[PDB]
Amino acid sequence: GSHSMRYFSTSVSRPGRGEPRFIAVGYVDDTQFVRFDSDAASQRMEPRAPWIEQEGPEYWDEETGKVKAHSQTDRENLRIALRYYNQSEAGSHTLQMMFGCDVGSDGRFLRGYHQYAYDGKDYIALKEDLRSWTAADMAAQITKRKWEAAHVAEQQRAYLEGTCVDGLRRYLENGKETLQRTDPPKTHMTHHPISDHEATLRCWALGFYPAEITLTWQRDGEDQTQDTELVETRPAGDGTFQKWAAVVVPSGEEQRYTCHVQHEGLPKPLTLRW
Amino acid sequence: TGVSQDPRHKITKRGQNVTFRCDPISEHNRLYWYRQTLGQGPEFLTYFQNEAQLEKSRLLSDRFSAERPKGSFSTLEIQRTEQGDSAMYLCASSLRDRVPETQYFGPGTRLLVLEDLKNVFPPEVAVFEPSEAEISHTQKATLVCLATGFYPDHVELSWWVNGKEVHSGVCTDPQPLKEQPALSRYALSSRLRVSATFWQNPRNHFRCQVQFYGLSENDEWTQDRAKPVTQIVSAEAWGRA
Amino acid sequence: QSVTQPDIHITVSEGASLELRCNYSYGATPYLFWYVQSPGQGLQLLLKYFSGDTLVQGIKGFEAEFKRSQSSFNLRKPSVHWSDAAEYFCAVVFTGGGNKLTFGTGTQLKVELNIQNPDPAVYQLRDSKSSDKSVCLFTDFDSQTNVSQSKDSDVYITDKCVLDMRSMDFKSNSAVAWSNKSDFACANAFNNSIIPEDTFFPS
């Protein structure tokens, strides 16, 4: 159905330690498939997925040339970012980047993003129309007016509408056994006591795909949030995601509580009990 | 504008090394290197952004060596030269901030590789004068310049009137030919036609300059004759009534 | 993916409608260029298009129209000059594949002189002081003439090259043939080539 693709960059300056560190990874919906490390001896666009190894040497010779084009452009960019903000040369800062295309169930273009970020806060962005910029501060309108004289938006848009989408359907076809099949969550419930009458229930759901899920601890047909410990969804290591939701109960009422797991792989929302 | 290169023509024997030195235009932070075989399209070899290399055509070998150490100028170097490497190497620069990403090329560097240096010869030049049959029929005089017994076909011809270059009325064969097509020394022809009223008065100087790209001062010359160095050989004629 | 130049070799007369085609691979949104390479020197940029005005004008009077429906970027010149004789390459930047230029097969163009007053003639030219040969000059003939080369050993023959007397509005073809032999006469040299009967010789 609906899928997406992202590309993440991370430039971090290290004064007194030589050239800064550039880290770039490539993401499909929830699966990383390429990576680049500026401090790696290979200096190539190494893969991080099985289905992507099919691409010939011309693919890796091209991706590598235009990700090293980025490390030298973003390092060049880091010095310019300092004198734009009049910061100290002996200081460390972080420059990030994110943009990719979102496709529908037919490979049809749906939305497009483009955002840079200097030290955790947004710097510049591309609007939804993919032809206009939105600078965050005055030091970014300096850059914004640079990418207005040069029609940068009409090239990035030509990428997201074009190269991004036309290339993404190639990835979905090359790995249809992995990226297109959604695993269901395996569910079960635990029980932990604390006091002589207070106990702690916990609803579990391990090993699913994708990450978007909702765990709901109800109580007699009415939802509950008081005394409901909830941790954010975490990865597993194989390509799946785990998530639990806890609740403290008194001894005697455990038969009243209920847990619900709403996900895609289950064509019915399960309703657990004790 | 514009991109520069040095040198423009050279030739070596297989086994040794070569080196070219390019110079792009001011404040240009991307530089490409291309190779263009004879009569074919320029092939891509390598490309820079700011002193560091980003790509190299995998259909090449490690014998090729390129570098842009100072951030502006680039230097190509080839080891173990062969005939299969003889082509024109063209420098090209861009800006990477122009969205169309325009690449501007230089004059390029033509090369040639052989099995031996027993082929080099400099050109002899001779200027021929128009006959009065055409002169007293059309009010126009047509001169003919020549260049014989040179090698290789790396010539550069130009006319000169009174020490000042002229092109209007100058025609020259775009390519040379072989004096022995069965092998071979090359020969080239050129002409200049002006009105006879500019041919008869004796103040017009008719000099035909033939510039030849030959050997350098680092090459070894063994033959018992004058070294065919890169020189300029010119022949001249005077106005005649 | 690749770019395609269908027009491999064209030869027209001076002042004709010219169109050279260069089509890209149906799917990409690349940068587009058109270069020219005279046989001696390097390339020379003519046009470019990524901004969004389909018809682009440039140097040497050339134009070009971008048609994404057809995926073509065609050179044009409503009146070709004699100086436009050179090879014409078109260059695209395959955007997602990087920034390296991807060239075409290579269109080689020659132009023919639309002469108006034919005046075929052959002349012997006065030799130089330090030269022994005697050259023969065929010039001022019509474009459709066929120059057949010589057969003898010491005799050589070239092809036609066009002069441009930019002042008098005078243009004409030419030809060279020479030898150092004593018997070799210029009044009998160009017989091996097909020339019209009105060949004018000196009296």
Binding site: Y7, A24, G26, M45, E63, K66, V67, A69, H70, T73, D74, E76, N77, I80, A81, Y84, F99, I142, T143, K146, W147, A150, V152, Q155, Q156, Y159, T163, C164, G167 | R96, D97 | T95, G96, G97, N99
Partner: peptide
């Protein structure tokens, strides 16, 4: 495919 990168 990695995209084309520009400077500030």
């Amino acid at each position: 495919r990695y995209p084309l990168t520009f400077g500030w």
